[PDB]
Amino acid sequence: PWAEVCEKFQAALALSRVPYKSKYSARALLEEVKALLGPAPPVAQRAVRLAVIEFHLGVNHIDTEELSAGEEHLVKCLRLLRRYISLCIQAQNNLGILWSEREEIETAQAYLESSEALYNQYMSKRFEKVYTHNLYYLAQVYQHLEMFEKAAHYCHSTLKRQLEHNAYHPIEWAINAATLSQFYINKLCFMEARHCLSAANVIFGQELYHQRKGEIARCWIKYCLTLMQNAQLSMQDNIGELDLDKQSELRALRKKELDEEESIRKKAVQFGTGELCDAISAVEEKVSYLRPLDFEEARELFLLGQHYVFEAKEFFQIDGYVTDHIEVVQDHSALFKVLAFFETDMERRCKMHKRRIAMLEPLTVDLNPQYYLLVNRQIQFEIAHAYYDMMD
Amino acid sequence: MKVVVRVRPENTKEKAAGFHKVVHVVDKHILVFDKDLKFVFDAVFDETSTQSEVFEHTTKPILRSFLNGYNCTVLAYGATGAGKTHTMLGSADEPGVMYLTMLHLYKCMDEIKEEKICSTAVSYLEVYNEQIRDLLVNSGPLAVREDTQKGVVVHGLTLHQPKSSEEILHLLDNGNKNRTQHATSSRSHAVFQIYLRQQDKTASINQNVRIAKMSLIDLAGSERFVEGTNINRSLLALGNVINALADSKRSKLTRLLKDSLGGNCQTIMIAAVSPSSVFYDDTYNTLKYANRAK
Ligand SMILES: Nc1ncnc2c1ncn2[C@@H]1O[C@H](COP(=O)(O)OP(=O)(O)O)[C@@H](O)[C@H]1O
Ligand SMILES: [Mg+2]
């Protein structure tokens, strides 16, 4: 009655998807599947289907994962199918979940590793989705295993795949890029990060609808903060207004080739699939920024474009985080002027102080005993005064 | 910045299904886990401590600073079965510290009913999955923002002005009756706020004197974990990966407590806990969590 078995199964399947709405009766269906199993015990494919049934039983055996017997079913299924479709790695991954509950990270990891390897050894919609889900699960594991680098790789892969399909939502991409760039900041791979937010910036062409822009701007700022740190690799306090006292080679062909060798992979990361890689090319104009010297006007300009976006955040925030963000921005612009190591250019240093003066009023506003908050702002005034100490 | 423990009494099942007891209370500051871990606290209550003892030995002393102009933060840490709600709300015979606080505050009101040109009021909401809902009136999500003097104002949160002891409990009950059902859900947090406006006898009737505020929080069941299979979760994971290892004991709760985790605060956390070996794993982690707090 195989047709009637699958018939009932499929009905049960839909029901398995369905004041509890599940478990209560889902478990009954679980048992109905076992009844359907009964009749089964060519035959080689029957055995495959048996593993599928027991798999389904394992799938059914959840009840908030109370039903550990499913684990037992799944192990058997594995053995049945190891002689030789893609649902089998799903099962492996599910076993990984069970191990996560048992804290057995390593075996779960091993399953995931082989899930990937297998598909690759092999070489139209389910897999397309599942594959990426798997990458996420790995990232979870990696969090626990602190395999941040590996996780990040997978993150890109999922970003890719989300881009390959229609998994789109601008806010998500924004925060994806945000955290990614932070990863790169954490790993100092600024050069890759460059296209990341800016790619998301392109994505934004298609509430947080407007408010997310400050989060985005903050990240643009982060770029600059670290680009300034790149500049501070030749710490401005230790050098004069001149640079490349160190090797010059800011765009050395040598480095271009090095970067190209790395770009064998970074271009893979450029997930613009030609069309949006051309959009990325428009972005690459911004990506070209690496370690600038006499570009404090341009540097500031880079800020100013996103400064104005920042000013919208000053608007969005109700005079609170306005200043938290301004705080950063003032230092940011001032740091461009640290790089603009000239006694003839201190007007901006004054302007940043002027903004701090605008930020003075908030210290009379904050009647909460936010001593250190207040002090931090006092330190900001000290910093402005330090600008002048250096001028004098 | 204090950490205390309330070891609950064992139940029928624990006595029938003789589970080995793991938690051993030694003295005011010491208890032993199993491991034989001599954990040291600011105060430990045993299986039989009364509500009056809990209140009188904690909150009552704390209120001395509250009345002196300090803000307070109360964290009822524990898992499902900890006794957290009974400790705060309580039974009719053994009402919790919230009731007792208010009754004690009525006494405090009487203490300064002549002395000060004071006024009080209260507020109360639920935090569930980081969502904020007023439990004193049926409302939607509340907007936590800073006010005209940077105070963390939960815009939309009501403020009430009761007088009698009947109202204390009556309203506490009414508020807890509006909490999300799992029996109260293990993921629900309760957040109360006591507003103490007061003006000293020698000060002008229009003299600017700061308001003392006490936050009472029933924390959700505390019970590194597999993450939900969602892209949003992945994004959160990415954010976590991006984040630096703060390693602090440590949300919308921290937003709510932004200015209540700072200076002039009387922060206290209690770990209401189970003595049975059935809950050994969580208990260990709880006690080690408490060490993170300490
Ligand atoms: N810490 C405790 N002190 C006294 N009795 C307790 C304690 N914990 C548990 N019991 C009692 O057994 C029950 C379990 O407490 P419980 O209400 O389940 O904590 P919660 O409901 O907040 O998870 C309660 O009725 C409580 O009064
Ligand atoms: Mg409760």
Residue numbers in the entry:
A (entry chain B): 5 to 22, 32 to 54, 86 to 128, 135 to 173, 200 to 282, 301 to 486
B (entry chain C): 12 to 45, 70 to 217, 223 to 263, 274 to 300, 310 to 353
Q: Which statements did the authors publish about this structure?
A:
After characterizing how KIFBP inhibits KIF15 (kinesin-12 family), we next aimed to establish whether KIFBP uses the same mode of inhibition for a kinesin motor from a different kinesin family, KIF18A (kinesin-8 family). In the structure, KIFBP N- and C-terminal domains engage both sides of the motor domain, while KIF18A-α4 is displaced away from the motor into the central cavity of KIFBP. To highlight the similarities between KIFBP engagement of KIF15 and KIF18A, we segmented the motor density from either KIFBP:KIF18A or KIFBP:KIF15. This comparison shows for both motors that (i) α4 is held within the central cleft of KIFBP, (ii) Loop-11 and Loop-12 are extended away from the motor, and (iii) KIFBP-L11 adopts a curved shape as it makes a ~120° turn to follow helix KIFBP-HP4a within the KIFBP cleft. Thus, KIFBP stabilization of kinesin α4 helix away from the motor is a shared mode of kinesin inhibition by KIFBP for KIF18A and KIF15. Second, KIFBP-L14 contacts β4-β5 of KIF15 and KIF18A with amino acid E168 in the KIF15 motor domain (or E161 in KIF18A) positioned to play a key role in this interaction. Third, ɑ4 helices of KIF15 and KIF18A become nestled into a multihelix groove created by KIFBP-HP4a, KIFBP-HP4b, and KIFBP-HP5a. Our cryo-EM structure of KIFBP complexed with the motor domains of both KIF15 and KIF18A supports a prominent role for Loop-1 in motor engagement. Similar to KIF15, the KIFBP-L1m mutant showed a threefold reduction in binding compared to KIFBP-WT. Intriguingly, the KIFBP-L14m mutant showed only a slight 10% reduction in binding to KIF18A compared to KIFBP-WT, in contrast to the 50% decrease in binding to KIF15. We showed that KIFBP uses a similar mode of inhibition for KIF18A, indicating that our proposed model is likely a general mode of kinesin inhibition.
Kinesin-binding protein (KIFBP), which is mutated in Goldberg-Shprintzen syndrome, binds to and inhibits the catalytic motor heads of 8 of 45 kinesin superfamily members, but the mechanism remains poorly defined. KIFBP interacts directly with the motor head of Kinesin-2 (KIF3A), Kinesin-3 (KIF1A, KIF1B, KIF1C, KIF13B, and KIF14), Kinesin-8 (KIF18A), and Kinesin-12 (KIF15) family members, resulting in inhibition of motor-microtubule binding both in vitro and in cells. We show that KIFBP is a tandem repeat protein constructed of nine helix pairs that assemble into a solenoid-like structure. Collectively, our work describes the molecular mechanism of KIFBP-mediated inhibition of KIF15 and KIF18A via binding to and stabilizing a conformation of the kinesin motor head that is incompatible with microtubule binding.
